[PDB]
Amino acid sequence: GMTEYKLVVVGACGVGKSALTIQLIQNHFVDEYDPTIEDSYRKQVVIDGETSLLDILDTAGQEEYSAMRDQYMRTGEGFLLVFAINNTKSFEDIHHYREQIKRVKDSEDVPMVLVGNKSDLPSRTVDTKQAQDLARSYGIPFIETSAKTRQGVDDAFYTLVREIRKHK
Ligand SMILES: */C=C\C(=O)N1C[C@@H]2CCOc3c(Cl)c(-c4c(O)cccc4F)c(F)c4ncnc(c34)N2C[C@H]1C
Ligand SMILES: Nc1nc2c(ncn2[C@@H]2O[C@H](COP(=O)(O)OP(=O)(O)O)[C@@H](O)[C@H]2O)c(=O)[nH]1
Ligand SMILES: [Ca+2]
Ligand SMILES: [Mg+2]
């Protein structure tokens, strides 16, 4: 009865993909999550009054082209583009992730949310306005999160569901 959405969490090594996902699903912050574990999780969620089943893939692996990775990513319906607000390289890498999503999905207008994680840290190198201007250019929402404090974590995933509902 309820819609199911396949969501995929992407972004550079160490930005908090696993921490964000494990906060959403299990309600705790993981300090040292094995950077090889790629796994999916399911969660029923009510968003704007309507329940959906989220099937969430937390990506991991090697920095390499993989045809089989393409085939799996093509089945994703929406993507979280995660960077860390204290890591300029992770923010520069966003463009590469968006390009790969569009490549494997035939240049669809893929539902995406830009996520600035580690908002609890005072060591910021990427300003809120720079990430808002990038999100504006791409036509997507921007959310600031902290997997450590839980701030914005539900909003990031909910916003992505809102984006898929608008697209479908
Ligand atoms: C510390 C290891 C780690 O987290 N990463 C990030 C990432 C892990 C997932 O692999 C990547 C993926 Cl899914 C894509 C990708 C493709 O291939 C198609 C569509 C969407 C999409 F996100 C990449 F483009 C990647 N590019 C480089 N490296 C990775 C991926 N990863 C390995 C490593 C940096
Ligand atoms: N201070 C802070 N550290 C974080 C946050 N999110 C993740 N981390 C830490 O950053 C490191 C990398 O996180 P992880 O989720 O493993 O990143 P992944 O490689 O993207 O899966 C870990 O030590 C986390 O505990 C956050 O919001 N704030
Ligand atoms: Ca848009
Ligand atoms: Mg991880």
Swiss-Prot record:
Impact reported for Q62H: In lung carcinoma
Domain of life: Eukaryota
Gene Ontology molecular functions: G protein activity; GDP binding; GMP binding; GTP binding; GTPase activity; identical protein binding; LRR domain binding; protein-containing complex binding
EC number: 3.6.5.2
Annotated positions of the N-acetylthreonine modification: T3
SUPFAM superfamilies registered for this protein in UniProt: P-loop containing nucleoside triphosphate hydrolases
Annotated positions binding GTP: 11-19, 30-36, 60-61, 117-120
Consequence when changing L20F: In OES; somatic mutation
Keyword Nucleotide-binding applies: yes
Listed InterPro entries: P-loop_NTPase, Small_GTP-bd, Small_GTPase, Small_GTPase_Ras-type
Motif window: Effector region: 33-41
Effect of Q62R: In a colorectal cancer sample; somatic mutation; promotes interaction with SHOC2 and PP1C
Related illness: Leukemia, acute myelogenous: A subtype of acute leukemia, a cancer of the white blood cells. AML is a malignant disease of bone marrow characterized by maturational arrest of hematopoietic precursors at an early stage of development. Clonal expansion of myeloid blasts occurs in bone marrow, blood, and other tissue. Myelogenous leukemias develop from changes in cells that normally produce neutrophils, basophils, eosinophils and monocytes. Leukemia, juvenile myelomonocytic: An aggressive pediatric myelodysplastic syndrome/myeloproliferative disorder characterized by malignant transformation in the hematopoietic stem cell compartment with proliferation of differentiated progeny. Patients have splenomegaly, enlarged lymph nodes, rashes, and hemorrhages.
Protein name: GTPase KRas
Protein source organism: Homo sapiens
High-level lineage: Eukaryota, Metazoa, Chordata, Craniata, Vertebrata
The encoding gene: KRAS
